[PDB]
Amino acid sequence: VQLVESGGGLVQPGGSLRLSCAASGFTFSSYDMHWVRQTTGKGLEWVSTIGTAGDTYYPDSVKGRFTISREDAKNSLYLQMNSLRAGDTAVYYCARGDSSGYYYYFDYWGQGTLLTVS
Amino acid sequence: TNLCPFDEVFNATRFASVYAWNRKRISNCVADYSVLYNLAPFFTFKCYGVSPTKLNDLCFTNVYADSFVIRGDEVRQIAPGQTGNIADYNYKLPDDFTGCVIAWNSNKLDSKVSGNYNYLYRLFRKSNLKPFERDISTEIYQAGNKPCNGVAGFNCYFPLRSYSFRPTYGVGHQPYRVVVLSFELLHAPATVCGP
Amino acid sequence: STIEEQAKTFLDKFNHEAEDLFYQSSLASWNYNTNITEENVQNMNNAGDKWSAFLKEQSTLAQMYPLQEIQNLTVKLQLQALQQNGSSVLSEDKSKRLNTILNTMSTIYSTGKVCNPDNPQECLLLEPGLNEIMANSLDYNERLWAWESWRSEVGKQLRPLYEEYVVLKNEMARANHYEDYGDYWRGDYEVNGVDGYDYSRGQLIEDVEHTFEEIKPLYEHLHAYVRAKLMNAYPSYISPIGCLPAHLLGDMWGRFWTNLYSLTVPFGQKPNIDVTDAMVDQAWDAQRIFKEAEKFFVSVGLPNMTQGFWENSMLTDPGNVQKAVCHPTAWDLGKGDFRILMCTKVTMDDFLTAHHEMGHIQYDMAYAAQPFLLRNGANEGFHEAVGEIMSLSAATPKHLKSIGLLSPDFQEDNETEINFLLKQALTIVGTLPFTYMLEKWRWMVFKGEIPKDQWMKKWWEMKREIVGVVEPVPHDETYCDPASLFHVSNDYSFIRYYTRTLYQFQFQEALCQAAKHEGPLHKCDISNSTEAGQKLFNMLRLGKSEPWTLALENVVGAKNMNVRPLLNYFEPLFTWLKDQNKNSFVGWSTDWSPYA
Amino acid sequence: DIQMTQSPSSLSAAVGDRVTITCRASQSIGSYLNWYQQKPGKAPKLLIYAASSLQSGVPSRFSGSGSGTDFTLTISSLQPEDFAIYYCQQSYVSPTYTFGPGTKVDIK
Ligand SMILES: *[C@@H]1O[C@H](CO)[C@@H](O[C@@H]2O[C@H](CO)[C@@H](O)[C@H](O)[C@H]2NC(C)=O)[C@H](O)[C@H]1NC(C)=O
Ligand SMILES: *[C@@H]1O[C@H](CO)[C@@H](O)[C@H](O)[C@H]1NC(C)=O
Ligand SMILES: *[C@@H]1O[C@H](CO)[C@@H](O)[C@H](O)[C@H]1NC(C)=O
Ligand SMILES: *[C@@H]1O[C@H](CO)[C@@H](O)[C@H](O)[C@H]1NC(C)=O
Ligand SMILES: *[C@@H]1O[C@H](CO)[C@@H](O)[C@H](O)[C@H]1NC(C)=O
Ligand SMILES: *[C@@H]1O[C@H](CO)[C@@H](O)[C@H](O)[C@H]1NC(C)=O
Ligand SMILES: [Zn+2]
């Protein structure tokens, strides 16, 4: 089981990007993917969640700005990011979530990719 | 393959007032959470104690669908461990509340230019309400120590007041329809699972 | 149970029903304003009557709540605000007589009409008839004639009636346990029960006096420059040392000296900073102007404005058959409804006015979570000052170049600085002495410090002492000069335009300190500075819950009204005024008069 | 949203010692808490779920306790590799999950 991130780089403010995560070692059609970003000081911050039945969740400051998606055939996770501001500079990780009943937790993350805006 | 009446709750023509919020018991049916997601964000969709993603393959005994209408700025009081008008006097949720809250704006449906006064809330009460307790009696609230004799006057006020929704209200005061799905897990077969 | 809980419950009831009825009345008034029809007038009148009756009933019911057995400051403030509203303390006969006095004030002021000699058919009203001739004509005789005719055909009709109004209002105020009606007006600045933030009602007079004493050199230099330029325009009409005539002050009353800019141009060879040509070239509409204003407002971190603002508020004149008032106003209908009412054109002045109204909307939105009685500025001057600081920031060339409204080839220089600063000082600096003298005169008349037989005699004394303005024709006691103004006749407190000014630069100079601005304060622009936005919003969200002293200190760091930022804002202008007036006499003598 | 806090912000301990780090929520959340460890240059790794249960494969020296508002994560014996940043995350409110500010555990 592994998760590999890609798509980070330097982009201009107000641009768009497509981050990708490749998952291996487990069935992609049984886990619910997440995108979590980390910045210095503010710490970790959940950014996106996608489940089995085509449902997408984002925070109030992120909803209407990003777009999560999944491909079970390719076992891949994608994140469209648009209207980028100066606060989006962060290290992004793709997360596999599993629930031991009523309790939900992030089992394993990837390696993360750094996105900076100038 | 009898789908649970979630369309009856969410697509109801007229929702109920918050002081007597419409509580519907859902049991012995296939729970169709499979279509509660493609309606896009409503304005708020928060599941406390559970996760929205894992709402397909978990068994529940009874589903309490509590439908009512409040304002936008006040739906934040629909949450465990919250204080406010709804929590104290209209609708209380326990600290151990396990369920979901679905809040969507209904300015198109629940507003009138002349004012939609059909929605009422209890503004005054002697004591705060316990979780899942409904009070419908409209006895005159006594503020002072002098008797009220059941007639409004000094320190004597009617407990129920009017939202009076109009389409030009702001987002915080627009008519938001709120459905609280309360999930109970007891020593029961819990016939509400869903494939 | 304690009386505090009873007061809290009654205040909750009043909050709810007052919110509902106020929204009803505001919606009816907005419908009338955007669409003047008989049915709209009837609906507005019905809503206003219901709102007023409810307010009177609630104040009457609240009068049996004693003030000093409730210890909560917010509850006490709301109870005092509600009890202060009810004026039903005297008998119904004299109350109705006083209402008749007020109605007579309004009708006589509104229907004032002056007929020129030898032609009692070609008569003009004050607006737009006499206002245009005051603000545009330069003929000494015509402006003098209009001045005397309007102050004689209306003031004489109001003088003894205004004395009766003063007597009745003094009786009502003493019936409300106040020293006079002036004490009643100063009660808006009163703070009690807060340790270290108390503000006695008599302290306002002393504070305003001290602030004017600090102002005086700047106003003296500006008056000297204006008088010198007018003497250049009128070689044989104004003495170099005498007071400025009252009929040569831009408008009639001399409230604003803006219209003298063409008579007081610093550099007549270079045009000022105007984006109207850029507005036409890029083909901007009202919606684009308001969207760029909202972009400016959100650049400093101010929150999103509801889409209902764009949906409901009319930005362009409907025209055709639908007639609407074209006065830019910011409507806070309550229950989350914020609108702007103005017939926007393709003009930079309309751009600045849109910014001012949008700042008013921001201020209204800030305290939307406060109780209904506290949903207002902490005093009478915070709201318009907060509205004006936004027009101050927007008008700077930095914002014009930031959003593409100004060509980058244009370079800011000290000439544009001087032009803009003098154009502002013709508005800010000019109105402060007039507001001071009018409010002080009304305060001491209410106190009774002026006997009636010396009203005008003293009214023109301050004009020769405070504003440095001499009347063109002497007036006896039959005249009533202050009643000729809209505010005095209609009985609106006028000090709110003084302190507001002294706030609009206290905030700005504070915000520029949070924006790390380098250079003159006139060139400061708070855009792209979230620190200044948060600092401002900290005071904006307070509303009337906290004392106005604490609200002011929340931004400026000082617990009292200050004018040092006002002088700092005009510091390069004040230095230029010193340079220009080093060879010109500064000061006015009361003995000099145009009629000698 | 539920604001989450951790204590102490900075911490130093020797190898083999026992350490306890506390986590506090703005409101009662029951036993819906998780503990993650993040070493420098690496992504955070799950340690504890449900605030009292052990993840598969993690050493038993990590333990979690507490319910309601106060939670504690205890390491009976400290290893040199334990120098990291520890995060507590509430799973009671979804999908807007929030993490703790992160407590730093060094090696003396
Ligand atoms: C009592 O309160 C009412 C609030 O509606 C006051 O009426 C408004 O007063 C403001 C300024 O004070 C005006 O700008 C509005 O136009 C007024 N509206 C109406 C409908 O009258 C009223 O002046 C207050 N009266 C006293 C004695 O305080
Ligand atoms: C309500 O009806 C609409 C239209 O038929 C449908 O799209 C929607 O899914 C219904 N809502 C629910 C909860 O089924
Ligand atoms: C203006 O009001 C009249 C009657 O009050 C109404 O007939 C008309 O439709 C209104 N105009 C608009 C544009 O709403
Ligand atoms: C006043 O009442 C309000 C609302 O009940 C409360 O929040 C506040 O703490 C009270 N203040 C004092 C000093 O009791
Ligand atoms: C709300 O404000 C943000 C900037 O803070 C802006 O990006 C967004 O477009 C605004 N919302 C709408 C509906 O325009
Ligand atoms: C503006 O600056 C220039 C640069 O030296 C100077 O020559 C000029 O006199 C200044 N303008 C005024 C009004 O002093
Ligand atoms: Zn204004």
Side-chain angles (χ1 to χ4, degrees):
Chain A
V1 63
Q2 279 181 256
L3 281 83
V4 185
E5 285 97 345
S6 60
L10 175 79
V11 298
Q12 301 298 109
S16 178
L17 258 186
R18 179 176 96 121
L19 283 72
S20 298
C21 180
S24 67
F26 70 100
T27 176
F28 198 75
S29 91
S30 227
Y31 297 79
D32 357 39
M33 282 303 121
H34 313 266
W35 280 108
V36 185
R37 96 190 178 193
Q38 177 166 18
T39 70
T40 308
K42 203 145 198 301
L44 284 165
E45 181 156 300
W46 170 83
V47 176
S48 296
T49 289
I50 192 167
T52 70
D55 62 358
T56 68
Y57 314 100
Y58 319 100
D60 290 346
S61 68
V62 173
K63 196 177 287 184
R65 178 189 279 180
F66 293 167
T67 304
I68 201 176
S69 46
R70 61 185 306 157
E71 268 189 311
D72 291 354
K74 298 183 185 169
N75 297 258
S76 176
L77 172 75
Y78 300 90
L79 181 84
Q80 277 304 126
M81 311 175 38
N82 291 62
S83 178
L84 300 167
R85 272 190 167 181
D88 305 291
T89 300
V91 193
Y92 285 72
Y93 316 82
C94 54
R96 204 251 301 171
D98 198 8
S99 76
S100 176
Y102 285 129
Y103 307 87
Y104 194 83
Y105 53 72
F106 301 170
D107 270 329
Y108 291 165
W109 293 354
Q111 289 82 61
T113 185
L114 195 141
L115 171 153
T116 175
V117 55
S118 292
Chain B
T1 67
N2 207 22
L3 297 101
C4 290
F6 281 143
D7 180 82
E8 272 198 40
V9 170
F10 286 79
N11 271 335
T13 300
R14 187 194 313 265
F15 273 39
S17 287
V18 60
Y19 64 93
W21 38 272
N22 209 1
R23 160 152 282 178
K24 174 172 311 153
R25 180 171 182 165
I26 301 182
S27 64
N28 293 303
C29 49
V30 169
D32 190 8
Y33 314 103
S34 297
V35 175
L36 187 63
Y37 302 134
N38 56 5
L39 269 294
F42 283 120
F43 163 74
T44 300
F45 182 76
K46 300 196 185 213
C47 288
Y48 309 88
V50 290
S51 62
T53 64
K54 246 82 188 153
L55 276 177
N56 251 342
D57 49 8
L58 196 153
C59 293
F60 293 126
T61 293
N62 309 303
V63 179
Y64 280 116
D66 301 332
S67 42
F68 54 92
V69 169
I70 48 181
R71 41 193 274 268
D73 265 346
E74 184 178 1
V75 67
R76 67 200 62 242
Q77 302 172 23
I78 313 293
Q82 280 284 310
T83 61
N85 260 332
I86 301 299
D88 291 331
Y89 313 140
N90 300 272
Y91 192 21
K92 190 63 183 171
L93 283 178
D95 286 317
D96 59 40
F97 172 64
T98 284
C100 299
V101 162
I102 301 92
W104 67 94
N105 201 322
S106 82
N107 203 30
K108 299 179 179 181
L109 282 72
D110 303 328
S111 287
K112 305 184 207 148
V113 176
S114 50
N116 184 17
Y117 289 76
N118 292 266
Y119 288 114
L120 298 173
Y121 72 105
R122 196 181 307 274
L123 184 49
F124 310 114
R125 212 165 169 294
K126 289 195 223 305
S127 60
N128 294 346
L129 265 180
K130 303 152 52 189
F132 304 131
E133 294 293 328
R134 293 179 293 173
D135 281 322
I136 297 169
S137 67
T138 63
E139 270 285 80
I140 305 287
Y141 171 72
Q142 188 200 1
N145 298 135
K146 293 185 178 182
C148 286
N149 306 341
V151 59
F154 197 77
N155 295 308
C156 299
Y157 322 118
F158 196 58
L160 301 203
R161 302 310 220 240
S162 296
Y163 291 163
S164 82
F165 287 128
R166 303 194 171 83
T168 46
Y169 278 179
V171 172
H173 295 260
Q174 265 167 31
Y176 274 68
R177 288 180 177 180
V178 180
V179 170
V180 184
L181 307 174
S182 299
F183 308 120
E184 205 178 36
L185 203 76
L186 300 165
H187 310 140
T191 52
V192 189
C193 308
Chain C
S1 68
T2 187
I3 208 71
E4 167 161 311
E5 288 169 334
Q6 281 159 79
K8 287 182 178 178
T9 300
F10 163 73
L11 279 175
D12 288 329
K13 156 173 174 57
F14 176 81
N15 284 354
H16 174 92
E17 271 82 2
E19 199 168 11
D20 200 354
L21 280 159
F22 181 52
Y23 183 90
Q24 293 195 234
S25 165
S26 309
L27 193 43
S29 188
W30 170 272
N31 291 327
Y32 161 72
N33 282 274
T34 61
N35 182 17
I36 297 156
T37 56
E38 306 83 50
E39 186 184 8
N40 287 133
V41 176
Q42 303 294 20
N43 286 124
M44 164 171 192
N45 266 28
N46 293 333
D49 290 346
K50 197 174 312 302
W51 172 229
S52 296
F54 162 85
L55 268 180
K56 176 195 164 192
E57 174 69 22
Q58 291 300 295
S59 190
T60 298
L61 192 152
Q63 276 182 353
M64 301 66 88
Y65 285 106
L67 282 189
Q68 61 185 357
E69 301 86 301
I70 295 94
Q71 276 68 240
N72 197 326
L73 291 169
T74 302
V75 171
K76 200 193 291 205
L77 268 176
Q78 302 182 240
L79 194 44
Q80 187 101 52
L82 187 42
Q83 283 170 7
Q84 193 272 10
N85 197 234
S87 180
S88 192
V89 67
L90 303 170
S91 60
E92 289 183 352
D93 178 72
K94 61 198 321 192
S95 162
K96 263 142 53 186
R97 175 31 190 261
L98 183 55
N99 270 257
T100 298
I101 304 305
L102 287 171
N103 284 346
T104 313
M105 291 325 317
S106 299
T107 61
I108 290 178
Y109 177 68
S110 297
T111 65
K113 188 171 177 65
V114 176
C115 297
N116 74 306
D118 290 330
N119 196 352
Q121 188 64 254
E122 185 197 345
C123 320
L124 300 163
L125 302 160
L126 169 65
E127 166 78 26
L130 289 186
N131 272 340
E132 195 274 329
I133 200 77
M134 281 295 188
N136 299 112
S137 70
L138 304 183
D139 187 58
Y140 185 101
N141 291 329
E142 196 175 12
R143 314 201 41 191
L144 164 58
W145 150 77
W147 200 98
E148 291 293 327
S149 311
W150 171 265
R151 266 172 183 81
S152 63
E153 292 186 355
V154 175
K156 314 262 181 53
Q157 294 185 51
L158 302 178
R159 167 64 192 262
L161 192 173
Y162 194 76
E163 316 209 340
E164 208 171 0
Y165 180 75
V166 163
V167 170
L168 282 177
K169 270 304 179 66
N170 276 325
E171 176 76 289
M172 196 216 67
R174 275 74 175 271
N176 279 101
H177 282 66
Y178 286 101
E179 288 179 30
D180 63 358
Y181 202 52
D183 205 340
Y184 175 81
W185 271 353
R186 299 182 308 251
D188 201 279
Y189 297 76
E190 179 180 22
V191 178
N192 289 311
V194 191
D195 293 329
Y197 290 90
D198 267 23
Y199 202 88
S200 72
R201 278 178 261 120
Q203 206 165 338
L204 170 70
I205 299 169
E206 326 198 322
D207 292 11
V208 170
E209 288 180 345
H210 292 18
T211 54
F212 194 31
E213 287 284 321
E214 278 184 337
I215 291 172
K216 214 162 281 163
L218 171 57
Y219 174 57
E220 279 262 1
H221 264 278
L222 176 57
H223 172 282
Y225 184 40
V226 166
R227 167 176 50 192
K229 294 298 286 185
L230 285 195
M231 181 265 308
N232 297 2
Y234 305 101
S236 62
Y237 274 140
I238 294 167
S239 178
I241 79 160
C243 302
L244 281 174
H247 74 283
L248 294 174
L249 291 203
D251 52 304
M252 191 164 189
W253 307 268
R255 187 177 177 194
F256 300 110
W257 299 4
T258 76
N259 309 134
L260 261 50
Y261 176 69
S262 72
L263 293 174
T264 43
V265 63
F267 314 99
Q269 295 302 110
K270 183 177 66 59
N272 74 47
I273 299 168
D274 183 13
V275 307
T276 308
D277 291 331
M279 291 275 188
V280 175
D281 291 331
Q282 175 165 347
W284 276 31
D285 62 358
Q287 188 178 2
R288 174 73 182 280
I289 290 173
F290 277 80
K291 294 291 308 212
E292 301 266 39
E294 188 200 8
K295 182 199 273 199
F296 155 73
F297 275 97
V298 69
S299 81
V300 306
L302 289 177
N304 286 81
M305 288 191 236
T306 305
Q307 185 197 346
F309 172 89
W310 307 107
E311 288 174 358
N312 312 134
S313 87
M314 61 155 198
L315 291 201
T316 61
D317 203 335
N320 292 318
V321 185
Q322 186 189 341
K323 194 222 291 173
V325 182
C326 282
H327 170 224
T329 61
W331 283 67
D332 182 11
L333 278 80
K335 259 152 188 184
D337 193 52
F338 310 93
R339 312 191 196 199
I340 282 179
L341 187 146
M342 43 172 301
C343 316
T344 310
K345 311 293 152 54
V346 184
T347 307
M348 185 209 184
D349 263 8
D350 294 352
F351 174 68
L352 305 188
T353 306
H355 272 261
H356 171 94
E357 301 311 318
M358 283 215 89
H360 273 286
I361 292 294
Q362 293 280 3
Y363 197 81
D364 289 329
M365 293 177 70
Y367 55 64
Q370 294 287 347
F372 180 86
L373 280 158
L374 310 182
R375 278 200 261 267
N376 205 359
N379 64 317
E380 295 173 348
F382 276 176
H383 217 299
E384 200 88 24
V386 170
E388 282 284 341
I389 66 178
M390 321 295 208
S391 61
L392 277 187
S393 297
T396 49
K398 152 173 174 199
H399 200 82
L400 301 179
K401 304 177 85 192
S402 175
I403 56 180
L405 277 180
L406 201 62
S407 47
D409 301 359
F410 193 91
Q411 193 62 253
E412 292 90 3
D413 62 358
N414 50 3
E415 321 186 60
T416 47
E417 159 192 64
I418 289 311
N419 289 344
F420 177 72
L421 274 189
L422 183 63
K423 196 67 176 295
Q424 294 290 273
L426 285 179
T427 305
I428 297 89
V429 187
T431 193
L432 292 177
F434 172 79
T435 298
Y436 175 53
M437 51 95 68
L438 189 144
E439 196 74 18
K440 191 177 172 65
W441 181 91
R442 279 202 290 189
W443 278 339
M444 64 183 73
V445 171
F446 291 150
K447 273 184 179 179
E449 302 180 349
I450 297 170
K452 298 324 186 81
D453 63 330
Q454 285 175 11
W455 267 10
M456 291 325 88
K457 185 202 178 193
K458 288 191 75 68
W459 168 265
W460 286 113
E461 268 177 4
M462 321 175 165
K463 270 274 195 177
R464 295 157 181 252
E465 178 197 328
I466 284 167
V467 187
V469 166
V470 55
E471 64 270 26
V473 176
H475 284 187
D476 49 17
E477 285 305 316
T478 61
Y479 286 92
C480 193
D481 290 333
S484 67
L485 192 67
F486 168 84
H487 299 75
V488 172
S489 81
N490 181 302
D491 186 74
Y492 293 150
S493 78
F494 205 71
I495 204 56
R496 59 178 90 226
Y497 314 81
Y498 178 87
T499 70
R500 157 209 81 90
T501 298
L502 258 61
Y503 301 146
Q504 75 183 359
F505 296 114
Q506 276 191 249
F507 301 150
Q508 174 87 337
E509 197 202 59
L511 296 192
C512 302
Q513 285 168 20
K516 317 300 180 31
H517 165 69
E518 291 268 11
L521 188 61
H522 94 284
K523 186 180 289 293
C524 166
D525 186 312
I526 72 167
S527 303
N528 295 324
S529 167
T530 52
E531 298 89 9
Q534 189 75 0
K535 179 182 287 293
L536 185 65
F537 183 83
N538 281 353
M539 174 263 302
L540 309 201
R541 64 152 292 268
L542 290 186
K544 259 182 62 172
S545 67
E546 321 285 320
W548 71 268
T549 49
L550 171 58
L552 186 63
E553 173 269 358
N554 269 22
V555 160
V556 306
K559 264 144 52 172
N560 214 310
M561 151 180 52
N562 220 34
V563 66
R564 175 196 41 80
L566 195 146
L567 315 181
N568 285 1
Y569 189 98
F570 296 82
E571 204 75 79
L573 182 64
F574 183 19
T575 284
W576 189 70
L577 288 163
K578 300 220 190 65
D579 196 313
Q580 272 291 319
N581 305 331
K582 72 185 180 300
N583 43 26
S584 286
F585 188 70
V586 177
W588 53 80
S589 182
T590 73
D591 57 355
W592 186 93
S593 75
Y595 48 86
Chain D
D1 204 358
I2 292 188
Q3 185 190 319
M4 185 64 72
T5 61
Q6 286 220 81
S7 295
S9 66
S10 312
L11 182 136
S12 308
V15 172
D17 210 6
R18 159 182 294 249
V19 65
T20 296
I21 45 176
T22 186
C23 173
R24 276 202 73 259
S26 71
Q27 80 203 46
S28 168
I29 63 171
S31 296
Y32 290 87
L33 203 79
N34 309 314
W35 286 103
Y36 305 95
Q37 158 160 251
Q38 187 197 23
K39 287 160 199 162
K42 311 266 161 285
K45 184 222 171 303
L46 184 51
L47 291 165
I48 294 292
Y49 74 75
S52 178
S53 278
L54 203 71
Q55 185 78 11
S56 282
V58 71
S60 280
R61 53 193 187 84
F62 291 99
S63 295
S65 179
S67 61
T69 303
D70 300 333
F71 315 87
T72 61
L73 183 80
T74 295
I75 321 170
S76 61
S77 200
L78 205 67
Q79 273 64 10
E81 81 264 6
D82 279 6
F83 151 70
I85 297 169
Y86 284 60
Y87 296 98
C88 64
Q89 182 263 10
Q90 51 93 11
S91 65
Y92 184 70
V93 183
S94 62
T96 308
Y97 293 121
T98 45
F99 294 78
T103 187
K104 195 182 260 283
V105 168
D106 309 293
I107 304 297
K108 259 185 179 163

